[PDB]
């Protein structure tokens, strides 16, 4: 059922990261 | 009935997810969205005769 459409990249548990800025740009 | 609402966020911009808690008339709306806030955000009540 699942086989581009799926992506993946410390954080506090149960947190979101919806920022796509460059961490020079990467 | 003046102080109505709150805003939360780490950078307070449209690049970081932000919180808006509006205690408006008859309701409370809590939203977590990528918001582009005003430089001086607020609400305004206007009387009618």
């Amino acid at each position: 059922l699942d086989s581009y459409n799926y992506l993946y990249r410390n954080l506090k548990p149960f947190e979101r990261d919806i920022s796509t800025e460059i961490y020079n740009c990467y | 009935n003046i102080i109505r609402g709150w805003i939360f966020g780490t950078t307070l911009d449209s690049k970081t997810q932000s919180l808006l808690i509006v205690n408006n008339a008859t309701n409370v709306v809590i939203k977590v969205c990528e918001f582009q806030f005003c430089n001086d955000p607020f609400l305004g009540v206007y009387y009618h005769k």
């Binding site: 149960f14 | 966020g9 307070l12 305004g44």
Partner: protein, 49 residues
Amino acid sequence: IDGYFKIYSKHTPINLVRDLPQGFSALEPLVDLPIGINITRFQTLLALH
């Protein structure tokens, strides 16, 4: 705390004109919102005449 946004409150009629009256009361738990973001800055929404 850990992606849970906790809101506590209590309402009290008071007389004192400018400052907290001498006395003691505790705030109720109300709601504990599941907001999974970080907060370091905040703002107060106000009503304007």
